[PDB]
Write a protein that binds this ligand. Structure first.
Ligand SMILES: [Cu+2]
Length: 123
């Protein structure tokens, strides 16, 4: 199945957000990122995707279809607005083995707070 995600300048959680910011998917699903506001992209974060997965980076303002195969958790960002907290978490399959590692990893304090809300007030 397909899961559609919007990239927005402003949303429920504030400025520069992905909606939804928590995405549950199964191997073989697709995640479609739609730039409803311009100035955004999607890129996988170094060491914050499962082992075996390839990294990716889309073009600014492009509609991007991501096919997820390897199970685990994926933290993705908007390259442009990562420092302002623009991130989304994709969880592929149940009990993603690297999720605690991702939560502990080093990242901007604004992104850390949003990530904690996605796993709490999101799952
Ligand atoms: Cu952005």
């Amino acid at each position: 199945e397909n899961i559609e995600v919007h990239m927005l300048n402003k949303g429920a959680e504030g400025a520069m957000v992905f909606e939804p910011a928590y995405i549950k998917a199964n191997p073989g699903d697709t995640v479609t990122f739609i730039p409803v506001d311009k100035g955004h992209n999607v890129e996988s974060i170094k060491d914050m995707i499962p082992e075996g997965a390839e990294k990716f980076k889309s073009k600014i303002n492009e509609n991007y279809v991501l096919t997820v195969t390897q199970p685990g958790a994926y933290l993705v960002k908007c390259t442009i607005h990562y420092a302002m907290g623009m991130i989304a978490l994709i969880a592929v399959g149940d009990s993603p083995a690297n999720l605690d590692q991702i939560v502990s990893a080093k990242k901007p304090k604004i992104v850390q707070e949003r990530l904690e809300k996605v796993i709490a007030s999101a799952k």
